[PDB]
Design a protein around this motif. Structure first.
Motif, PDB file in Angstrom:
ATOM      1  N   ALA A 111      -5.585   6.604   9.727  1.00 54.82           N
ATOM      2  CA  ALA A 111      -5.368   6.181   8.351  1.00 54.82           C
ATOM      3  C   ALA A 111      -6.301   5.054   7.928  1.00 54.82           C
ATOM      4  CB  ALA A 111      -3.914   5.749   8.158  1.00 54.82           C
ATOM      5  N   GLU A 112      -7.093   4.505   8.853  1.00 52.54           N
ATOM      6  CA  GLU A 112      -8.027   3.429   8.542  1.00 52.54           C
ATOM      7  C   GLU A 112      -9.417   3.673   9.117  1.00 52.54           C
ATOM      8  OE1 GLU A 112      -6.238  -0.103  10.039  1.00 52.54           O
ATOM      9  OE2 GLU A 112      -4.632  -0.157   8.542  1.00 52.54           O
ATOM     10  N   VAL A 113      -9.722   4.897   9.554  1.00 53.94           N
ATOM     11  CA  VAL A 113     -11.019   5.155  10.169  1.00 53.94           C
ATOM     12  C   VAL A 113     -12.122   5.078   9.116  1.00 53.94           C
ATOM     13  CG1 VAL A 113     -11.272   7.650   9.908  1.00 53.94           C
ATOM     14  CG2 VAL A 113     -12.048   6.526  12.014  1.00 53.94           C
ATOM     15  N   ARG A 128     -13.596  10.267   3.239  1.00 56.69           N
ATOM     16  CA  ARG A 128     -13.499   9.899   4.644  1.00 56.69           C
ATOM     17  C   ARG A 128     -13.962  11.020   5.567  1.00 56.69           C
ATOM     18  NH1 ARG A 128      -8.025   6.981   6.183  1.00 56.69           N
ATOM     19  NH2 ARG A 128      -9.032   5.385   4.881  1.00 56.69           N
ATOM     20  N   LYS A 176       0.823  -1.203   0.000  1.00 53.32           N
ATOM     21  CA  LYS A 176       0.000   0.000   0.000  1.00 53.32           C
ATOM     22  C   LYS A 176       0.860   1.257   0.000  1.00 53.32           C
ATOM     23  CE  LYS A 176      -3.643   2.106   2.736  1.00 53.32           C
ATOM     24  NZ  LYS A 176      -4.664   1.446   1.883  1.00 53.32           N
ATOM     25  N   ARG A 213      -9.624  10.828  -1.307  1.00 54.27           N
ATOM     26  CA  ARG A 213      -9.811   9.905  -0.192  1.00 54.27           C
ATOM     27  C   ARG A 213     -10.187  10.643   1.087  1.00 54.27           C
ATOM     28  NH1 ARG A 213     -11.914   7.105   2.429  1.00 54.27           N
ATOM     29  NH2 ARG A 213     -11.421   4.974   3.116  1.00 54.27           N
ATOM     30  N   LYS A 233     -11.125 -10.369  -0.102  1.00 52.30           N
ATOM     31  CA  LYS A 233     -11.118  -9.113   0.637  1.00 52.30           C
ATOM     32  C   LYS A 233     -12.458  -8.393   0.541  1.00 52.30           C
ATOM     33  CE  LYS A 233      -9.246  -5.267   2.506  1.00 52.30           C
ATOM     34  NZ  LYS A 233      -8.910  -4.227   1.493  1.00 52.30           N
TER      35      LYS A 233
HETATM   36  C1  LIG Z   1      -7.590  -2.673   5.394  1.00 50.46           C
HETATM   37  S1  LIG Z   1      -6.945  -1.501   4.230  1.00 50.46           S
HETATM   38  C2  LIG Z   1      -8.286  -0.636   3.460  1.00 50.46           C
HETATM   39  C3  LIG Z   1      -7.744   0.530   2.661  1.00 50.46           C
HETATM   40  C4  LIG Z   1      -7.501   1.707   3.584  1.00 50.46           C
HETATM   41  N1  LIG Z   1      -8.598   1.851   4.496  1.00 50.46           N
HETATM   42  C5  LIG Z   1      -9.906   2.203   4.033  1.00 50.46           C
HETATM   43  C6  LIG Z   1     -11.042   2.340   5.024  1.00 50.46           C
HETATM   44  O1  LIG Z   1     -10.111   2.390   2.847  1.00 50.46           O
HETATM   45  C7  LIG Z   1      -7.330   2.975   2.769  1.00 50.46           C
HETATM   46  O2  LIG Z   1      -7.754   4.075   3.215  1.00 50.46           O
HETATM   47  O3  LIG Z   1      -6.749   2.932   1.653  1.00 50.46           O
END
Ligand SMILES: CSCC[C@H](NC(C)=O)C(=O)O
Ligand SMILES: CCCCCCCC(=O)O
Ligand SMILES: CCCCCCCC(=O)O
Length: 571
Positions: free
Chosen positions: A289-291, A220, A193, A216, A434
């Motif tokens: 970064a993952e909320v 979010r 990533k 993004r 996934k």
């Molecule tokens: C488990 S990784 C998922 C990707 C990551 N989270 C989200 C919520 O998209 C991102 O912002 O790119």
């Protein structure tokens, strides 16, 4: 400060300072043994403490890249071990640093980490705990030279808490192995990533990364205004720009500032940040970064009013193009969390091209009147691919879905090396597990943004040793069109079949001692060579030999003749 090494040492603390410095040395010099890096980090740590005492001391005013760069050139016989890389030590910053980034090896021909027994690991963790963690930071950073350095500290923190909790448990293996296996899978997910963020900055510039950041963050944080997102976009861009350039000290220091600014203004950003800002400093940045996506504000106006039916569309666009285009992306991304980030960039790219063409006419409004209708085919294209492929995965299963995608992409580009085709196609099958379980509202954003990461893995693995012009074309084309470019590829008819080699399909009893996951990689490797040798082989003929192969390994491994079953079946 006047001394930059003193400013980072005081802001990051001594523990994180030593860790980030070790990650920096291990990413640049990946083949150097573990003992050589420990000496360099300690000498940097000793030198850093002298600058904290007095920032006017010797060598304390030089730049962080000159310090770290000069230390990299002190290790004797760097030319002997690393070949011609030492030619770049004869350079001046920032030229010397740029080449040190060029020689980062994404596939550094390193042996696979054999995991010792749990009692041995718990013994070494009890003997020298400080050395045990440094070996984890060291071994991971070599094989992933673009790892998100502040995130790697969090993985190291959970790697330590795993041995702290499990080594005292009665059944150490039942505790430690689920946590170590999850850390490895989550670790490789963070690496691939992060490699996309670095490839977007290095190959396509800051402008391509800011567009990704606006999309993004708007998805979010839909409640935040454009000026607030633009503040978060500008700061987040600076963080990842430094991490990808090797500024690991400034990167982790700036991410801590960004996470502190976000958590202090949650009401102006999002409501999902409340439960995660109560976590420690290292864990806080990981969750943000993952909320989850904040609920978009209800009763939002249609985008036609501000961008289609308006008198100053060309006036505001000509005054500030990237600002006007940035507002369009922010307003379109916040309203559509069901779109992928890459799809939103295509629509913004499409809207930009229309304004450049239509604002030139005498009646611009009549020209760009049907600009939003142009988005209709772009939205349906990924939906058809995800709908058809998820149906194929649900009726086949992950392993069979990998083999189906393996043969597909091997026929697409047969020039790519077999180990690269295996890993990429294996990760292309993991997107089904996934997010094919997700509903269509959350299926496209995850499926396509995952494909952009996995395809970028094929990009950088093929970049080092280019063997096919079609991959190079779809990789360097436009980034956002990487998935459509690869998906639109067909069977390479110009490819000549590879000559037969009986030594490729020979096996020994060593495959029986391998794990199940390592055994299917051994099987998928032979399938790539089989498709390369017979590019016109039908789908059912490939099954007959693969079904023959699966039973032939199970028959030979289960029997008593160790190498006789494999050797006699070599005909
Ligand atoms: C488990 S990784 C998922 C990707 C990551 N989270 C989200 C919520 O998209 C991102 O912002 O790119
Ligand atoms: C330090 C907090 C950064 C939050 C932005 C995360 C963007 C993303 O990768 O989805
Ligand atoms: C869930 C979508 C899976 C896409 C796999 C690759 C499809 C293709 O490009 O042939």
């Amino acid at each position: 400060h006047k001394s930059e090494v003193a400013h980072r040492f005081k802001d990051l603390g001594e523990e994180n300072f030593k860790a980030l410095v070790l990650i920096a040395f291990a990413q640049y010099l990946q083949q150097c043994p573990f003992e050589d890096h420990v000496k360099l980090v300690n000498e940097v740590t000793e030198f850093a403490k002298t600058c904290v005492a007095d920032e006017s001391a010797e060598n304390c005013d030089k730049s962080l890249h000159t310090l770290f760069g000069d230390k990299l050139c002190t290790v004797a016989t760097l030319r002997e071990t690393y070949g011609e890389m030492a030619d770049c030590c004869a350079k001046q910053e920032p030229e010397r640093n740029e080449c040190f980034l060029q020689h980062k090896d994404d596939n550094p021909n390193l042996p696979r980490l054999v995991r010792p027994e749990v009692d041995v690991m718990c013994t070494a963790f009890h003997d020298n705990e400080e050395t045990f963690l440094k070996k984890y930071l060291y071994e991971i950073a070599r094989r992933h030279p673009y790892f998100y350095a502040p995130e790697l500290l969090f993985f190291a923190k959970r790697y330590k808490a795993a041995f702290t909790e499990c080594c005292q448990a009665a059944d150490k293996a039942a505790c430690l192995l689920p946590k170590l296996d999850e850390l490895r899978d989550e670790g490789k997910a963070s690496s691939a990533k992060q490699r996309l963020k670095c490839a977007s900055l290095q190959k396509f510039g800051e402008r391509a990364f800011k567009a990704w950041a606006v999309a993004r963050l708007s998805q979010r944080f839909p409640k935040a205004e454009f000026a607030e997102v633009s503040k978060l976009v500008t700061d987040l861009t600076k963080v990842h720009t430094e991490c990808c350039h090797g500024d690991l000290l400034e990167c982790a220091d700036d991410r801590a500032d960004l996470a502190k600014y976000i958590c202090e203004n949650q009401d102006s950003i999002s409501s999902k940040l409340k439960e995660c800002c109560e976590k420690p400093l290292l864990e806080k940045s990981h969750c943000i970064a993952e909320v989850e996506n904040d609920e978009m504000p209800a009763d939002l106006p249609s985008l036609a009013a501000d961008f289609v039916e308006s008198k100053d569309v060309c006036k505001n666009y000509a005054e500030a193009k990237d600002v006007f285009l940035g507002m369009f992306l922010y307003e379109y991304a916040r309203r559509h969390p069901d779109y992928s980030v890459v799809l939103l960039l295509r629509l913004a790219k499409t809207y930009e091209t229309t304004l450049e063409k239509c604002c030139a006419a005498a009646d611009p409004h009549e020209c760009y009147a049907k600009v939003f209708d142009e988005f209709k085919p772009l939205v349906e294209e990924p939906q058809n691919l995800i709908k058809q492929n998820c149906e194929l995965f649900e009726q086949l299963g992950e392993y069979k879905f990998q083999n189906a995608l393996l043969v597909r992409y091997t026929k697409k580009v047969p020039q790519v090396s077999t180990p690269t085709l295996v890993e990429v196609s294996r990760n292309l099958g993991k997107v089904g597990s996934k997010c094919c379980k997700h509903p269509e509202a959350k299926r496209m954003p995850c499926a396509e943004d995952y494909l952009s990461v996995v395809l970028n893995q094929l990009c950088v693995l093929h970049e080092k040793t280019p063997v096919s012009d079609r991959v190079t074309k779809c990789c360097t084309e436009s980034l956002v069109n990487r998935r459509p470019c690869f998906s639109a590829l067909e069977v390479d008819e110009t490819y000549v079949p590879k000559e037969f080699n009986a030594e490729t399909f020979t096996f020994h009893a060593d495959i029986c001692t391998l794990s199940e996951k390592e055994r299917q990689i051994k099987k998928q490797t032979a399938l790539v060579e089989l498709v390369k040798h017979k590019p016109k082989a039908t789908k059912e003929q490939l099954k007959a030999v693969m079904d023959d192969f699966a039973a032939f390994v199970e028959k030979c491994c289960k029997a008593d003749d160790k190498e006789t079953c494999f050797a006699e079946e070599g005909k």
